[PDB]
């Protein structure tokens, strides 16, 4: 299920509420939802080994994981945590995260390559769920 490729975000719901739930400074919340801050996603997939890059205006995040192999990473609000990714179907994977230090909401995310060629991502902080929808390029 080649998640590989370069991804262009074309929709995003409930994102500010997610940040709000996580505790994100209001000023950062407002800049976070600007048409300028739209993230670009590059995924590089081979087997159970994944490389995903997320790039905004002045920041980038790189993660490297194997499905099943626990790894270190950051939440959405950038808190250090341990993560573990598993398959849900052929075209879906889900990742649960465990805060390294401190304690806050229960976070996670999922990734879903559809049949109409889209890539759906969800992110969850406790009750609240954010969906974002990507296309290739
Ligand atoms: C949908 C995902 C979004 C809008 C990602 C936002 C992420 C960031 N990051 C990581 C960042 C770092 C510095 C300054 C601004 C940001 C922004 C809020 C765009």
């Amino acid at each position: 299920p080649n998640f590989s490729g370069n991804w262009k975000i074309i929709r995003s719901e409930n994102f500010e509420e997610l940040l709000k739930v996580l505790g994100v400074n209001v000023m950062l919340r407002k800049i976070a939802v600007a048409a300028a801050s739209k993230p670009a996603v590059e995924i590089k997939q081979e087997g159970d080994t994944f490389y995903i890059k997320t790039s905004t205006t002045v920041w980038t995040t790189e993660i490297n994981f194997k499905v099943g192999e626990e790894f270190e990473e950051q939440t959405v609000d950038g808190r250090p945590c341990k993560s573990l990714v598993k398959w849900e179907s052929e075209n879906k994977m889900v990742c649960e995260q465990k805060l390294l230090k401190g304690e806050g909401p229960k976070t996670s995310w999922t990734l879903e390559l559809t049949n109409d060629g889209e890539l759906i991502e969800t992110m969850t902080a406790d009750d609240v769920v954010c969906t974002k929808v990507y296309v290739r390029e």
Side-chain angles (χ1 to χ4, degrees):
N2 75 129
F3 285 90
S4 286
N6 297 280
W7 292 93
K8 157 176 143 66
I9 190 174
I10 74 171
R11 210 188 316 165
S12 162
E13 77 182 28
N14 260 294
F15 185 54
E16 185 179 358
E17 287 76 25
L18 192 85
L19 299 189
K20 178 148 190 169
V21 168
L22 286 171
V24 176
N25 169 255
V26 69
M27 297 186 180
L28 185 62
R29 290 208 291 260
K30 296 300 166 165
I31 203 65
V33 300
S37 302
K38 316 275 272 301
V41 176
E42 179 196 359
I43 298 169
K44 230 67 223 160
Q45 163 176 15
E46 196 66 44
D48 61 333
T49 308
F50 280 85
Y51 167 80
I52 302 166
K53 200 206 314 185
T54 322
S55 282
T56 63
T57 38
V58 293
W59 202 276
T60 90
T61 328
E62 297 177 65
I63 69 175
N64 285 290
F65 64 80
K66 274 176 181 66
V67 172
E69 197 178 33
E70 181 179 345
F71 63 97
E72 220 183 88
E73 180 193 27
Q74 300 177 327
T75 57
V76 189
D77 63 340
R79 298 170 70 180
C81 72
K82 312 253 94 181
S83 286
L84 179 54
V85 172
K86 286 163 191 179
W87 292 97
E88 190 144 290
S89 64
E90 190 188 355
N91 294 338
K92 175 156 189 184
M93 81 200 80
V94 319
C95 163
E96 64 223 358
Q97 304 169 332
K98 318 132 192 166
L99 293 187
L100 286 178
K101 318 172 188 184
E103 268 167 359
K106 182 175 168 183
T107 68
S108 55
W109 53 269
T110 78
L111 265 185
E112 205 181 321
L113 217 194
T114 91
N115 296 289
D116 44 70
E118 285 172 346
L119 171 74
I120 309 164
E121 177 199 2
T122 83
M123 295 172 297
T124 311
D126 274 331
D127 289 18
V128 170
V129 185
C130 157
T131 305
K132 309 177 113 171
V133 193
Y134 298 83
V135 297
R136 253 184 187 91
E137 58 148 71

